[PDB]
Amino acid sequence: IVGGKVCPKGECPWQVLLLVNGAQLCGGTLINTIWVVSAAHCFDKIKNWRNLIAVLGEHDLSEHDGDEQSRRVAQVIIPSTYVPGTTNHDIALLRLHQPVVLTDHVVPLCLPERTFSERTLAFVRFSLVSGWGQLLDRGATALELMVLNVPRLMTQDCEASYPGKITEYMFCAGYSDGSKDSCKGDSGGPHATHYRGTWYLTGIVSWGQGCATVGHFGVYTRVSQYIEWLQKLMRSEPRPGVLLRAPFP
Amino acid sequence: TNTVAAYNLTWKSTNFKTILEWEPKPVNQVYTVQISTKSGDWKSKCFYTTDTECDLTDEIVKDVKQTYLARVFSYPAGNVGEPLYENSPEFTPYLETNLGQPTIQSFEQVGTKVNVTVEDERTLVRRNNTFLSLRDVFGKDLIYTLYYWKSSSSGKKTAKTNTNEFLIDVDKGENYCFSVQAVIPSRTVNRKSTDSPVECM
Amino acid sequence: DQCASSPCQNGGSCKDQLQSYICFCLPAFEGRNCETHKDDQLICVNENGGCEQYCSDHTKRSCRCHEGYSLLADGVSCTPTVEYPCGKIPILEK
Numbered sequence: 269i270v271g272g273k274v275c276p277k278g279e280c281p282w283q284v285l286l287l288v289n290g291a292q293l294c295g296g297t298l299i300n301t302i303w304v305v306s307a308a309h310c311f312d313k314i315k316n317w318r319n320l321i322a323v324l325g326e327h328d329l330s331e332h333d334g335d336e337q338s339r340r341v342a343q344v345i346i347p348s349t350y351v352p353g354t355t356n357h358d359i360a361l362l363r364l365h366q367p368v369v370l371t372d373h374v375v376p377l378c379l380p381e382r383t384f385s386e387r388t389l390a391f392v393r394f395s396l397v398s399g400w401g402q403l404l405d406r407g408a409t410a411l412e413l414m415v416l417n418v419p420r421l422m423t424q425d426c427e428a429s430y431p432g433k434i435t436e437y438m439f440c441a442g443y444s445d446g447s448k449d450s451c452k453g454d455s456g457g458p459h460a461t462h463y464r465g466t467w468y469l470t471g472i473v474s475w476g477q478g479c480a481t482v483g484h485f486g487v488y489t490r491v492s493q494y495i496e497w498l499q500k501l502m503r504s505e506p507r508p509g510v511l512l513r514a515p516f517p
Numbered sequence: 518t519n520t521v522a523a524y525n526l527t528w529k530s531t532n533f534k535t536i537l538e539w540e541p542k543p544v545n546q547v548y549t550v551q552i553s554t555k556s557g558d559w560k561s562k563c564f565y566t567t568d569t570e571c572d573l574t575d576e577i578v579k580d581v582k583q584t585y586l587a588r589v590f591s592y593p594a595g596n597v598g599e600p601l602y603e604n605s606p607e608f609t610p611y612l613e614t615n616l617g618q619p620t621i622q623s624f625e626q627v628g629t630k631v632n633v634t635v636e637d638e639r640t641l642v643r644r645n646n647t648f649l650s651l652r653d654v655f656g657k658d659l660i661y662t663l664y665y666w667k668s669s670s671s672g673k674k675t676a677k678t679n680t681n682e683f684l685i686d687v688d689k690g691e692n693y694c695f696s697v698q699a700v701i702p703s704r705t706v707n708r709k710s711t712d713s714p715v716e717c718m
Numbered sequence: 719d720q721c722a723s724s725p726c727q728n729g730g731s732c733k734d735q736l737q738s739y740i741c742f743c744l745p746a747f748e749g750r751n752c753e754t755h756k757d758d759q760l761i762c763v764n765e766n767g768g769c770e771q772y773c774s775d776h777t778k779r780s781c782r783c784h785e786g787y788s789l790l791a792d793g794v795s796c797t798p799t800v801e802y803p804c805g806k807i808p809i810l811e812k
């Protein structure tokens with residue numbers, strides 16, 4: 269996260285940390301005790317799917333205070349329409365092998381209905397994005413969870429920054445003055461929108477041209493397009509093999 | 518090409534009565550308007566209308582010093598990855614709303630002096646279930662210019678006031694006509710109102 | 719004065735300008751001529767139909783709640799039915 273602030277311990281309770289071989293990979297969003305939403309591109313290069321780990325209730329990576337809960341990722345589900353090395357359909361649904369326990373420091377973000385997200389949440393100006401990613405473009409990652417308030421754009425207003433590159437499965441958020449943005453390592457993290465006392469999942473940190481670069485915005489995966497797809501899969505019975513390309517729509 | 522984007526978005530605003538106007542007349546499509554401040558949520562108005570206008574008064578009077586942006590969505594008729602839209606110019610009500618035509622409330626004469634009182638024009642800014650006056654909103658920012666003359670006046674004379682009354686000197690036996698103009702000297706655009714209807718002794 | 723047409727509807731008040739007019743409307747009305755009723759607009763596209771969470775048409779007007787919440791008697795509010803409902807932050811809530 270560039271130009272943000274440390275998220276106070278417990279105030280971003282749905283934030284997930286994904287590790288591979290103990291190494292920092294990406295962020296993610298808990299939406300119930302079993303299921304986590306992340307970015308598809310985070311998994312382009314996994315060699316050993318058995319060493320894939322999700323950590324909840326995390327805050328400081330350099331310390332262990334006892335609120336952390338680790339779970340093995342039993343399944344990574346990705347839209348069949350997603351193509352590794354490209355931007356479109358950058359979303360993944362992760363099944364934890366065992367559910368996490370909900371606590372003051374571990375709580376799911378709500379997955380909204382499509383209509384509600386399209387009609388109401390889409391027009392809430394600001395939303396929070398968070399992660400342990402780079403503090404600057406091509407800089408070092410953060411040890412403490414970082415958070416950032418960013419404004420949302422409809423795509424005609426983003427069109428100039430990314431001509432013919434923003435699909436209906438994306439949206440832009442951030443600042444063209446090059447001061448605040450999500451960044452490498454924040455992928456899969458929530459873009460979370462508050463409405464009437466409750467927080468909802470509206471976006472996923474996906475991609476951008478640099479980080480907080482003048483004249484450009486962060487690009488986020490438009491979660492509203494995947495509500496139906498996500499809910500159908502949360503009902504499907506588990507299958508052998510960690511990775512799974514599920515048809516979209 | 519199920520819809521066409523609106524265009525020539527224009528703010529029509531007088532005493533804070535603020536209407537957004539656009540083209541074209543709807544063909545097989547309907548419009549929805551949104552308005553916001555630079556950092557506020559979007560508020561929708563005039564849902565699925567076939568009008569080429571939208572009254573946004575109740576939104577802008579909430580804070581007339583804020584700078585507002587509106588946008589008109591085009592929806593295909595009967596079929597209500599986003600809809601086409603167009604952005605309005607930015608609009609700051611306190612600085613841009615047209616001062617309405619003033620009106621002379623009264624004028625009294627005694628001796629070689631005359632009072633000319635301007636009616637305190639009420640605006641569309643509601644507060645406590647009542648409409649605030651033009652001077653309630655602008656205070657010292659607002660002045661009035663009095664034009665006054667007689668049948669034999671080679672030219673109109675001018676007076677000015679920080680309030681709503683003029684106290685001028687006149688010739689004993691002569692009848693004068695009057696006309697007032699509302700001015701906000703600090704403005705850069707729409708600095709002056711139109712002239713008031715003329716009242717004569 | 720162009721107000722002689724009495725364009726301002728619904729108990730509105732007309733005020734004459736140079737070559738037009740403006741309508742002062744009652745609190746329940748807006749529009750150039752006070753023609754719009756502010757009450758007759760209970761739809762999901764308009765302020766979420768007054769629902770706290772989910773809304774539905776076609777004609778809220780049927781509000782609903784996310785899992786872990788239930789709809790209250792007012793027919794618009796949602797209340798948690800579990801200890802750790804989604805989208806709420808315990809450390810602040812307390």
Ligand SMILES: *C[C@@](*)(O)[C@H](CCCNC(N)=[NH2+])NC(=O)[C@H](Cc1ccccc1)NC(=O)[C@H](N)Cc1ccccc1
Binds near residue numbers: 354452473
């Ligand atoms: C995977 C995530 O950690 C990371 C988040 C980047 C968010 N950036 C801003 N400014 N908010 N995403 C990436 O690193 C992607 C990876 C990628 C995705 C699709 C295709 C190829 C690579 N890379 C970027 O975001 C860079 N801007 C590079 C880039 C890739 C693709 C298109 C345009 C730029």
Ligand SMILES: *[C@@H]1O[C@@H](C)[C@@H](O)[C@@H](O)[C@@H]1O
Binds near residue numbers: 730731744
């Ligand atoms: C003019 O103003 C409107 C708002 C109403 O109060 C009318 O009764 C009045 O004459």
Ligand SMILES: [Ca+2]
Binds near residue numbers: 326336
């Ligand atoms: Ca830790």
